[PDB]
């Protein structure tokens, strides 16, 4: 089992531990659970979903990277698929606060990127900051998203975000997790195509600047991120971050990053380039290439 | 009167117009009103503060810069001083969504930077996004801040941000607008010192990386911004933005920017440098210098 889970795992309940140990066994346990696993989990313990999710939090939080805060936050997004995706915050020393990733964004994009069509609920070990409540309201699940916090009843997003601002305010009709395909031709090597492919699924109704980032690991593994705009602009999820979320959740570490490509239009109104390299360099990867969309 | 106000002004009520015209007369009307002016305003019209603020919105919104959205948002922060500060959103073509400024952040930092000790209320022509509700909760006014929106009753922040996350969650005791002075020696030319001075008032309890940006205009005017962290990290106000807010509100335009300096520690965990130049270049200023704090 991935050491990141060591401690957490140890404070889990005996029957839960047993049910889990087989799954967590793999270092490369993908920080996710299929329906089937959930069911199994539910039988070995007498937990109901909600209780199960709360019970897994600490594992989701085990994946956090917080050199600054030291404030571990885990989240679990529940697919309409039955799959549960873990999420955890990340802070990058050498960059800016604007580069940070919240547990919630982590889980939701984990899910989105993985192909999930919609979420039903999300569970966090801490009340969501306003930045995340706003991030949440961009999804096709709307104000209905259900949110579970420890020691609280469940509530819909609408309750956490009264009189909310969202895509409708801007006359935006396509929501995050809705089906998208911008249609750019994939070209170049693998990495280039992984980037372009991500740019293709990007959510960018406000600025109309598609973008994607793909990261190649030592072992030739390839994690890629899609750009995700937000109505309030600022909470937008830059493409780099997408990739790093996957990369981390999945058991990898920065240093395993071999090379990275970024794809975008040259003439787009918004430009990912600088923030991408910068942060990437901050992480120690100077191998950045960019590919121009068309 | 600054053309930016032309249209707005024209749809104001006759008695309000009259009361205003003398003030708005100056191109360099500083997008702000002293107590005295407010009083005068109140007498010429029979308005009460709240109604007065709602009535001035469109002027606050006249100051917006929205090449992307085209979504003008104005805000008015009311000092405990009796001074009212205007605010408006800004979007920068060529940068990223994370560089955007919300009307609310604009007003609050307008006030903060101007020396305001605390706010009593804020009025916006649109419901605040979650990013701003979060930004608001960093102030020393806490959940008590009062918020006025058109067609709604007033409410405290707590109402817009139920079960909120904030500085206390991180054990942070110094709030934004509280009195701060990091104690760096001012040095170099004017610009350098303006930068350092700003770095000195910066709010950075989470990362501990002070920073400041000062901009010199053609005419030798100098606008400077202070760094403002936020508990949720992301909503943090980078130092550059500070300066540009003032610069815009005050009647200036990008192209009047002559040179700019940024001050920060070299070894800080967070680094403003890249985002600063980048955006600055995006705006057409390549004249960036950095000064190392100590
Ligand atoms: O991850 C979350 N989610 C919740 O909305 C609130 C806060 N945090 C975060 O937890 C840390 C403290 O702000 C940061 O890494 C920031 O991303
Ligand atoms: O300025 C605000 N304040 C409110 O919290 C909500 C939205 N906007 C903004 O208005 C525009 C649309 O998102 C952007 O410039 C963004 O900064
Ligand atoms: Zn958050
Ligand atoms: Zn806002």
From Swiss-Prot, chains A, B:
<feature type="binding site">
    <location>
        <position position="102"/>
    </location>
    <ligand>
        <name>Zn(2+)</name>
    </ligand>
</feature>
<feature type="binding site">
    <location>
        <begin position="89"/>
        <end position="91"/>
    </location>
    <ligand>
        <name>substrate</name>
    </ligand>
</feature>
<comment type="function">
    <text>This enzyme scavenges exogenous and endogenous cytidine and 2'-deoxycytidine for UMP synthesis.</text>
</comment>
<keyword id="KW-0479">Metal-binding</keyword>
<comment type="subunit">
    <text>Homodimer.</text>
</comment>
<keyword id="KW-0378">Hydrolase</keyword>
<dbReference type="GO" id="GO:0042803">
    <property type="term" value="F:protein homodimerization activity"/>
</dbReference>
<dbReference type="InterPro" id="IPR050202">
    <property type="entry name" value="Cyt/Deoxycyt_deaminase"/>
</dbReference>
<dbReference type="GO" id="GO:0015949">
    <property type="term" value="P:nucleobase-containing small molecule interconversion"/>
</dbReference>
<dbReference type="GO" id="GO:0001884">
    <property type="term" value="F:pyrimidine nucleoside binding"/>
</dbReference>
<feature type="active site" description="Proton donor">
    <location>
        <position position="104"/>
    </location>
</feature>
<dbReference type="InterPro" id="IPR013171">
    <property type="entry name" value="Cyd/dCyd_deaminase_Zn-bd"/>
</dbReference>
<protein>
    <recommendedName>
        <fullName>Cytidine deaminase</fullName>
        <ecNumber>3.5.4.5</ecNumber>
    </recommendedName>
</protein>
<dbReference type="Pfam" id="PF08211">
    <property type="entry name" value="dCMP_cyt_deam_2"/>
</dbReference>
<dbReference type="InterPro" id="IPR016192">
    <property type="entry name" value="APOBEC/CMP_deaminase_Zn-bd"/>
</dbReference>
<comment type="similarity">
    <text>Belongs to the cytidine and deoxycytidylate deaminase family.</text>
</comment>
<dbReference type="GO" id="GO:0042802">
    <property type="term" value="F:identical protein binding"/>
</dbReference>
<dbReference type="GO" id="GO:0004126">
    <property type="term" value="F:cytidine deaminase activity"/>
</dbReference>
<dbReference type="GO" id="GO:0008270">
    <property type="term" value="F:zinc ion binding"/>
</dbReference>
<dbReference type="InterPro" id="IPR020797">
    <property type="entry name" value="Cytidine_deaminase_bacteria"/>
</dbReference>
<feature type="domain" description="CMP/dCMP-type deaminase 1">
    <location>
        <begin position="48"/>
        <end position="168"/>
    </location>
</feature>
<dbReference type="InterPro" id="IPR006263">
    <property type="entry name" value="Cyt_deam_dimer"/>
</dbReference>
<feature type="binding site">
    <location>
        <position position="129"/>
    </location>
    <ligand>
        <name>Zn(2+)</name>
    </ligand>
</feature>
<dbReference type="InterPro" id="IPR002125">
    <property type="entry name" value="CMP_dCMP_dom"/>
</dbReference>
<dbReference type="GO" id="GO:0006217">
    <property type="term" value="P:deoxycytidine catabolic process"/>
</dbReference>
<feature type="binding site">
    <location>
        <position position="132"/>
    </location>
    <ligand>
        <name>Zn(2+)</name>
    </ligand>
</feature>
<dbReference type="InterPro" id="IPR016193">
    <property type="entry name" value="Cytidine_deaminase-like"/>
</dbReference>
<dbReference type="GO" id="GO:0005829">
    <property type="term" value="C:cytosol"/>
</dbReference>
<feature type="domain" description="CMP/dCMP-type deaminase 2">
    <location>
        <begin position="186"/>
        <end position="294"/>
    </location>
</feature>
<dbReference type="Pfam" id="PF00383">
    <property type="entry name" value="dCMP_cyt_deam_1"/>
</dbReference>
<dbReference type="GO" id="GO:0009972">
    <property type="term" value="P:cytidine deamination"/>
</dbReference>
<keyword id="KW-0862">Zinc</keyword>
